Design a protein around this nucleic acid. Structure first.
Ligand SMILES: [Mg+2]
Length: 460
DNA sequence: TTTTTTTTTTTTT
């Protein structure tokens, strides 16, 4: 049984992993060294008739719902192809921004179509990765050997195509699958030691081994939330485990200003923390970040950021060191910072994270999954979690409408009307109109916009 | 195994 990597990319009909719908899936299996060892896997998803794609998405992809309808299968079947692949044992599933995008799409796809939302990321020696912060880490800590591209600002960029184009390699789902593989090869070759460190430290216990909460042991963290002006980097001190989020540890940015932490109380810090930057004043921002141990965060030994590297990124070493001393010498801050986080929708599509399912409920859902579509009306199952009845109804109506009775068909009509209100339909047309006037002399973009209008006429 | 819709930021469609 061989360890593989499954590189994958989704095209979608919008940015929202729960509310929007997938259009296309692309994947290829490689060996540990990133040599291709299987056929390309590309296929489309038919959108159910309770949905209209966002115009912006479709303009970027070039994939129309008509195209997807013609070329694809229903979501249930789409979910089932994606799942067989994903649950091949000893598979590491990865892409480019997948942890914060594609993996969300996957969780919701399995959630909607009765597969476990997470098991593909851990069962049977499975795992996941994401090359995005690998690229960021490399630039920040061992930039040598790779060309780092900039914007009209001078800031380093990490858009995939910007990176591949800058390194003489090369929208199209399968093309992005190759670009990701190519990017994995590049770093592996130019910086194997860092690559090894980041691969090994995906592990949460490996990460906990690095996290010393009681002593506030300083670390280097790379993250987009720091922004390209610092090359996404800073030194960090772990203060506490998040009181409500098992996968989060509360951390202080040692480069920021630690006086609002020293001075304000917990309630004022909380209020300060949740004020936007624009409607923030002459006041300092609270320099606290959550780091999520399950999301392949880049966390290394403090001294991994080399003096010259810190100097390149313009990160004040002594300032950090000063803050770390103060924080260690003011234990009460920890009490306040934790208290910040100890405070705490009718669409079932949006309620995946409401919680796990009981044991009765998972066995029942298992049976939903194993039943031929045609046989579900004959089932009559009882669930406890109120999500499931709704999950089931959407599942059946969206994927197997030939299967619904009149009551169910009436319920579905109602549902469609509640989605396609006149106010929603007005909003959709306005956007299309607005867009057709912006790209009036673009034969490609005008024809997409037009196909989107027709599709709305034809399904609503 | 997980964090949904207050903040940071940048990328994903
Ligand atoms: Mg992508």
């Amino acid at each position: 049984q061989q360890s593989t990597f499954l590189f994958h990319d989704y095209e979608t009909f919008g940015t929202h992993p729960a509310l929007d719908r997938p259009a296309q899936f692309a994947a290829i299996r490689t060996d540990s060294e990133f040599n291709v060892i299987g056929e390309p896997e590309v296929f489309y998803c038919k959108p159910a008739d309770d949905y209209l794609p966002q115009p912006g998405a479709v303009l970027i992809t070039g994939i129309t719902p008509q195209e997807a309808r013609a070329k694809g299968e229903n979501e249930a079947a789409f979910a089932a192809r994606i799942h067989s692949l994903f649950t091949v044992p000893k598979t590491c599933i990865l892409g480019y921004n997948n942890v914060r995008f594609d993996d969300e799409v996957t969780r919701n796809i399995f959630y909607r179509n009765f597969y476990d939302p997470y098991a593909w990321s851990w069962q049977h020696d499975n795992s996941r990765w994401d090359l995005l912060d690998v690229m960021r880490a490399c630039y920040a800590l061992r930039p040598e050997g790779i060309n780092w591209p900039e914007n009209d600002d001078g800031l380093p960029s990490f858009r995939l195509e910007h990176l591949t184009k800058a390194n003489g390699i090369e929208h199209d789902a399968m093309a992005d699958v190759y670009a990701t593989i190519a990017m994995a090869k590049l770093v592996k070759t130019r910086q194997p030691r860092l690559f090894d460190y980041l691969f090994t430290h995906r592990n949460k216990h490996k990460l906990m081994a690095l996290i010393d909460v009681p002593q506030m042991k300083p670390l280097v963290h790379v993250s987009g939330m720091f922004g390209a002006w610092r090359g996404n980097t800073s030194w960090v001190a772990p203060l506490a485990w998040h009181p409500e989020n098992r996968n989060a540890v509360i951390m202080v940015d040692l480069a920021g200003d630690i006086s609002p932490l020293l001075e304000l109380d917990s309630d004022t810090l909380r209020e300060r923390l949740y004020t936007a930057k624009t409607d923030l004043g002459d006041n300092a921002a609270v320099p606290v970040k959550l780091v999520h141990i399950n999301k392949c965060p880049v966390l290394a030994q403090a001294n991994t950021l080399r003096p010259e590297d810190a100097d390149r990124l313009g990160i004040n070493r002594q300032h950090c060191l000063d803050n770390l001393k103060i924080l260690r010498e003011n234990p009460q801050v920890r009490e306040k910072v934790v208290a910040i986080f100890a405070e705490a929708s009718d669409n079932v599509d949006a309620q995946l994270y409401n919680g796990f399912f009981s044991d009765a409920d998972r066995a029942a859902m298992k049976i939903v999954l194993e039943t031929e579509p045609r046989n579900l009306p004959a089932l009559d199952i009882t669930f406890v979690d109120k999500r499931i009845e709704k999950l089931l109804f959407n599942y059946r109506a969206r994927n197997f409408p030939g299967t619904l009775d009149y009551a169910e068909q009436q319920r579905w009509l109602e549902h469609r009307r509640q989605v396609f209100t006149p106010e929603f339909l007005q909003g959709y047309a306005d956007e299309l109109q607005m867009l057709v006037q912006q790209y009036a002399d673009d034969k490609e973009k005008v024809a997409l916009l037009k196909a989107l209008w027709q599709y709305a006429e034809e399904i609503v």
